[PDB]
Write a new protein. Structure first.
Lengths: 44, 44
């Protein structure tokens, strides 16, 4: 559960990296990685 | 691209709803929905 927290806080930090990249490879990566934390968040 | 922005800004608003729900059904929903915006973000 604090793990879900560690997963969400980091997915949040990563969607924010995606966002500033949006304003290529590193945007792709940041979204992939964030999806990961969210799948963990979902199963957690 | 501003669409990727609209997708990311909203996925961000949703991982934040998940987070406060974390501190059941609505946490599940918020993560599902956020994953959606991120898949759109990825394909976009």
């Amino acid at each position: 559960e604090e793990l879900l927290k560690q997963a969400l806080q980091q997915a949040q930090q990563l969607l924010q990296q995606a966002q500033e990249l949006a304003k290529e490879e590193l945007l792709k990566q940041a979204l992939q990685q964030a999806q990961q934390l969210l799948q963990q968040a979902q199963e957690l």
